Amino acid sequence: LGLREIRIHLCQRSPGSQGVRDFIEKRYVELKKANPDLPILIRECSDVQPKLWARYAFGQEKNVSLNNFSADQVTRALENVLSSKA
Amino acid sequence: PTVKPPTARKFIWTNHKFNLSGTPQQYVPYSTTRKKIQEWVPPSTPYK
Amino acid sequence: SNLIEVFVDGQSVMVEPGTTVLQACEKVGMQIPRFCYHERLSVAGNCRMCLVEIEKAPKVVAACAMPVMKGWNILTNSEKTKKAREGVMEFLLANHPLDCPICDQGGECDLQDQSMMFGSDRSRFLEGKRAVEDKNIGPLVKTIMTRCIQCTRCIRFASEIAGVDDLGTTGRGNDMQVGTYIEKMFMSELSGNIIDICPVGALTSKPYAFTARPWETRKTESIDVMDAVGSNIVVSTRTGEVMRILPRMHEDINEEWISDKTRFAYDGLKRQRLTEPMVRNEKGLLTHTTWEDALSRVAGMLQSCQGNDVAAIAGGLVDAEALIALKDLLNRVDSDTLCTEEVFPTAGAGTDLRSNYLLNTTIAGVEEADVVLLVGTNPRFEAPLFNARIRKSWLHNDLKVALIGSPVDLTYRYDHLGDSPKILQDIASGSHPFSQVLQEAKKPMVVLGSSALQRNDGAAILAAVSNIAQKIRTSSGVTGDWKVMNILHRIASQVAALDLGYKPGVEAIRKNPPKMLFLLGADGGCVTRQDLPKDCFIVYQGHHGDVGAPIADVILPGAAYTEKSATYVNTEGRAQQTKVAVMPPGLAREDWKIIRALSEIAGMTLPYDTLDQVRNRLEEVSPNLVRYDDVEGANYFQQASELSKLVNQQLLADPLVPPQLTIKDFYMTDSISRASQTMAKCVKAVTE
Amino acid sequence: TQLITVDEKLDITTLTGVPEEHIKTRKARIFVPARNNMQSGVNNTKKWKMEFDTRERWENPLMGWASTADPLSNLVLTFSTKEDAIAFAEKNGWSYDVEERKVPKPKSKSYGANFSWNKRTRVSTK
Amino acid sequence: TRPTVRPRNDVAHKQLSAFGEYVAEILPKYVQQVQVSCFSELEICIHPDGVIPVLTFLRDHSNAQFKSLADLTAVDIPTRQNRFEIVYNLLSLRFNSRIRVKTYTDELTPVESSVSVYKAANWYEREIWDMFGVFFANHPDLRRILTDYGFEGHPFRKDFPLSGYVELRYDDEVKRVVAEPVELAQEFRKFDLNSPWEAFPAYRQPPE
Amino acid sequence: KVSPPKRAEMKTSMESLIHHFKLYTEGYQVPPGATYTAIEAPKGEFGVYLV
Amino acid sequence: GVRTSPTGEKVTHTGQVYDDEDYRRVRFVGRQKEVNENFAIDLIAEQPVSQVGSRVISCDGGGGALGHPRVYINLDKETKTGTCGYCGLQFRQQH
Amino acid sequence: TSVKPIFSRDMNEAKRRVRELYRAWYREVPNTVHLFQLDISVKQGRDKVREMFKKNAHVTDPRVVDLLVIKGKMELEETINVWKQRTHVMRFFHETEAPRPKDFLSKFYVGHDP
Amino acid sequence: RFRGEHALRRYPSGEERCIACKLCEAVCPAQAITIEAEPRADGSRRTTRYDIDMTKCIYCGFCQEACPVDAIVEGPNFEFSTETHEELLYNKEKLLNNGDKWEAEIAANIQADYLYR
Ligand code: SF4
Ligand code: SF4
Ligand code: SF4
Ligand code: SF4
Ligand code: FES
Ligand SMILES: [K+]
Ligand SMILES: [Zn+2]
DSSP states (O other): OOOOEEEEEEEEEEEETTHHHHHHHHHHHHHHHTTSSEEEEEEEEEEOOEEEEEGGGGEEEEEETTOOHHHHOOOOOOOHHHHHOO | SSOOOOOOOOOOOOSSOOOOOTTTTTTOOOOOOOOOSSSSOSSSSOOO | OEEEEEETTTEEEEEOOOBHHHHHHHHTTTTOOOOHHHOOOOOOOOOOEEEEEEESSSEEEEETTOOOTTOEESSSSSSSHHHHHHHHHHHHHOOOOOGGOOOOOOOOOOOHHHHHSSSSSSSSOOOOOOOOOOHHHOSSSSEEGGOOOOOOHHHIIIIIIOOOOOEEEEEEEOOEEEEEOOOOOOOOOOTTTTTHHHHSSSETTTTTTTTTTTGGOOEEEEOOOOTTTEEEEEEEESSSSSSEEEEOOOOOOSSSSSOOOHHHHHHHHHHSSOOEEEEEEEOEEEEOOOOHHHHHHHHHHHHHOOOGGEEEEEOOOOOOOHHHHHHHHHHTTTTEEEEEESSOOOOOTTTTTTTGOOSSSOOOGGOOOOOEEEEEEEHHHHHHHHHHHHHHHHHOOOOOEEEEOOOOOOSSEEEESSTTTTHHHHHHHHHHHHHHHHHHSSSEEEEESGGGGGGGTTTHHHHHHHHHHHHHHHSSSSOSSSOEEEOOOOOOOOOHHHTTTTSSSSSHHHHSSSEEEEEEETTTHHHHHHHGGSSOOOOEEEEEESSSTTOEEEEEEEOTTTOOOOOEEEETEEEEEEOOOSSOOOTTOEEEEEEEEHHHTTTOOOOOSSSHHHHHHHHOOOOGGGSSSSOOOOOOOHHHHHHHHHHHHOOSOOOOOOOOGGGGGGSSSSGGGGGOOOHHHHHHOOOO | OOOEEEOSOOTTTTSSSSHHHHHHHHHHEEEEOOOOOEEEETTTSSEEEEEOOOOOOOEOOTTTTEEOOOOTTTTOOOESHHHHHHHHHTTTOOOEEEEOOOOOOOOOSSSSSGGGGTTTOOOOOO | OOOSSSOSSSSHHHHHHHHHHHHHHOOOOOOOEEEEESSOEEEEEGGGHHHHHHHHHHOOOOOTTEEEOOOOOEEEEETSOOOEEEEEEEEEEETTTTEEEEEEEEESEEEEOOOOTSSSSSEEEEEEEHHHOOETTTSSSSHHHHOOOOOSOTTSTSSOOOSSSSSEEEEEEETTTEEEEEOOOHHHHHHOOOOOSSOGGGGOOOEE | OOOOOTTTTTOHHHHHHHHHHHHHHTOOOOOOEEEEEEESSSSSSSEEEEE | OBBOOOOOOOSSSSSSOOTTTOOOOOTTSSSOOOOOOHHHHHHHHHHEEEEEEOOEEEEEOOGGGGSOOOOOOOOSSSSOEEEEETTTTTEOOOO | OOOOOOSSHHHHHHHHHHHHHHHHHHHHHHHHHHHTSSSOOHHHHHHHHHHHHSOOOSOOHHHHHHHHHHHHHHHHHHHHTTOOOHHHHTSOOSSSSSOOOOSHHHHHHHHHHH | OOOSEEEEEEOSSOBBBBOOOOOHHHHHHHOOHHHHHEEETTTTTEEEEEEEEEEOOOOOOHHHHHOOOOOEEEEEEOOOOSSSGGGGOOOOOHHHHHHHHHHHHHHHHHHGGGEEE
């Protein structure tokens, strides 16, 4: 019936999350200026793989692998999940 | 002890008791410590 | 290379200049006996136990106070070293009283241990020993001054770390007594740590006195939850009963010290417990019942509610496992109304980035700074070990401390800027020279307490301090890896709740009134039944029945922090795990087990049944909660600064008054301390 | 040749005679024990230790002792190195967690700093 | 030094060191270490693959004549990969000497039986199996000798607890004694008695 | 340090009370080393292998 | 002198009395609860206070080797009488 | 990784020894039932033998299953002669044991044991 | 020197000899002695629970020599066979009653024997 939260995991130093970092350094703020009541939790770690977890209504959750993604591919996947509302 | 009586004390028994095992006056073990964990007493008045 | 080579027992080793003999002997893995030396206190050099012999030198030197030089050979097992050790031991045991059976230090006494290891086996003292008059220095530290050896760790601890300057050495010669010369009640936030550093039984723990013996106690390591520092502690237990709490050697947080609340919370931990589930009967009184009946009633009321009609409140002593279990259970019913007792501003970035709700540098990062600004906090009571670290940096690294708020005592000297919030507008503009002071600072630090955010202008204060921090960092010549902005939390479960996606503050509950409310240890009494409608199925899930239990409709007993393997995150974002010391009393069970069984009754069971699977779910939500003893850097300060400038609030004229001012308010913080007769005795003793 | 190349996993869980309840529901802990803070000795912090989590111990209804039902509550093992303890934990099929050795950092001590001319590290009394 | 200290022997130390050198130079295939203790006891640490020849040498040489077998002891040290230490004790009646032969063996690898050298070990190592699980190949009759028939596991291993896993009690419903999970009336109180101070400086391990 | 002192001297001297405390609670520290000492029991050779 | 809780069961010198709702009292019916009629605190409460003229007194419990180890008691504080830690006797300075 | 074998050089010889041990046990089970005047049937005892044989079936190390074959052969030899009593035979059937809870709800009700 | 039934002695002033130092429970080879202590009303360090399991005890006399105040004594009584198992599980009160019963001969025995110790 609708998404409720977005969770984006990354690493500080690894290159595989680097493009994901290139999203956060560029286009995150306008995202928080676009959906102010939608919590997009950014979680940094040390050696984890890039990932994108979305929670929907009644506990439904989907997973997207953001491994070795560039900034524009991350933007495409994230606009897909916010515009999905499955 | 008719010539070497024992030393008189204030706590030494004046009546020797034999083995009372099997009698109603036998020994029963029990814990000598009080309750360890206390319990929360619910209030005596309703929440209305 | 400036390092020099010295010799111990014919073996070469490479040490730094300025390194004493004892540090080199510890570098080669040996322990020279000592009584007055301490690795965290200044060198006194008076016990004379550490005497060793340098070869080709006919005088013994004190290994705790003699710097080494190149070419020195140290003989730690020669004849004259053993003779000196035996003589010093005989002199120490000459006037020591025969009190070993009735002394709590027995079994862990330094004097007995090194008397067996290095002393002789008989006493030649045929005279009459001395007798020292006892003293009464408080209701926590039992004092018997006859057993003291004048090691003067009391004096250095009171003058250097606690900084109270009350203890002293009165008199001359063998009649000199370690005391205060008057009936002075020595009370401080770090008093009980002197019981750690007394090598003899002169100072003992008064609640622990004549209760146990160290050889029959099992030690279980755990984490403190009373404060948000995350103190690594150990619990000594005896036959399934919690006896005493000691610190642990963790150099990054609580090096070997703890606060008095952690040291004496166990008496409250063993009183006023909840041992059996209770439900309201027809008369409205709380009456005992079975687990299945209470769970069935809660599930039956839960299945009717949907949407915003159900909400939950997280307490200050609830682990992340129960938090994620309740979050997923309330997400099974499609309810995001998850609230915490402590209020944090969600304006702008909010809880998304981890940079704006963590102590971003380190607890130990204060050792690296030179200018520290405190805004609206009293760290002497909210986080005593953080204030101890600040005092250590102020003593050794010549740190500069300035505080905004009421001029409280912080056991050192600082710069009191003021109490109105408008002073931040004087700093963010550049009117006062203190702005230039942090501009010229190489490693500046801005610390904002979480008690100031409890006011109605927390967003404005956070925006002002973030503006100050990002004005300093983007203009001054800072390295970049240095994190200026820091937020000090005073609730153990606050960081774990914020990392889990909870909504801080109770605003979402008073906005839309829920018909069924969870109280996961909501002992603060943040919302009364008046703010809620006429019929609410309030369910309390906690160990101590303090505030929410008399108003709850169903009471579910839980496990305390010593009775479950629990994940807690301190104020700096470091995850830690507690261990099981004892069992919950009666029918009380672990909290996540209760939530999972409730979902199994309700027909919305979660896909985990064991604790490691709960930790796997925690890793799925956020990995930082499952990698223990590791601190992850919280980046992206500029994005949070840009998001904080979108909406601007107005700072009010209310002075930044912390809720704690004196030592009286320090002992009354949580539900565990509210059931402690030791803390009641401390409050009574400090209020006279 | 009288030697066989076996690359199979070294598992002897079925040879020790332990019931299954105590090889899958238990958590082995490998750690260096903390120094007792009432003593300055560090001789007990040189060997790694393997321990098990404490299970339920209740009170005897007759006389009041600590009656337990866990057979491994008094089983603490000593190992010289971490990897050997890890191998012994993997060998018996126990799920295990390891805490790192918390070495004390090398402090900088100086007797002269108690009598500095202008620094804040002067001793108020001696 | 004189009244309250045990006197030291040096001629026995010299003779034991000489015989240890002689043994180590006479069987270089299997010997690994030779040590003489402070109280004049000779210990030979040899490879397991020479369990049969070396002892047989000590049984049949003119200069050894270790005819008597005193002990067959297994020591469990869990911190090694070969956690079992099989130790033979031999006594020579002609030269009046005592010797100790040590070998290492883990759980799975077998060791050849020393029945053909000393027949007393035909019982002794049998008990070793019943206490340790160390299999002895080519044993004539190897089975349990001390524990119960339905006993699972080996008790003397250091991971085995003090109290067992089962207890016996008589039930009238089945008219039989039966095994139940162990539930003690009082838990065995573990006493922490290790001193936190160093005792012997000459026994100190080098740092890591 | 090995044999406990007398009862008359443990109530007068400090060192005797300390050594009585540790011997009857902790026990004396035996140095590492394995020995096999055998005596002539009336049945035969009785030996103890102590480690 | 012992006390009497109102369930009919005697009071031990420690202070252990089974409650009215405790079933363990069924172990006492048909038998007796063995307690000590000589309370130690009451037995030492009638001992006189020894008045000495020395600042430091020495106590060994009487009989030499048949008593507790010798302990020295300071009597500087005139507010509180110096009480021996082993035997419980108390000494008072005349001055 | 090269080790000394016990009796079996590879997995096939250990499987053959497992087969032979199971054959001998299946031969013995009626005689064991008759000798001790047992209360069980023959098929119940054979079901117990199969249940042990399949419980101890998730290990693939040839030395481990070789040691288990040797221990099972000792068990078989002890049942060949009259060395065990009725108790040691009946110990495999946990009859007087109360059935422990298995699901999460009953385990939550009875205590803290996971 | 006969070793028999355990008993708890008293001072010649009415006060109990034991000071709850827990040496006897640490030296006991059979762990038959259980001690639980708390500081009582007058501040003296005294026992609250002193349990001796006579079915566990091996009558070795380590407690009577480890005791620094001669509180616990292996007394002279040997005719104390019981008809029930729990009657051999002594608490503090039974031991104190045994001491009060047999002090008139335990004092004489320890007076005759103490010069050998
Ligand atoms: S502090 Fe003194 S009385 Fe206490 S155990 Fe140590 S030596 Fe004995
Ligand atoms: S009371 Fe203890 S810590 Fe204080 S000076 Fe004396 S021995 Fe040192
Ligand atoms: S005689 Fe020995 S076994 Fe018996 S209670 Fe005393 S110390 Fe324990
Ligand atoms: S040894 Fe003596 S004084 Fe110490 S606890 Fe035992 S009976 Fe009491
Ligand atoms: S440790 Fe050096 S004199 Fe005390
Ligand atoms: K102390
Ligand atoms: Zn006295």
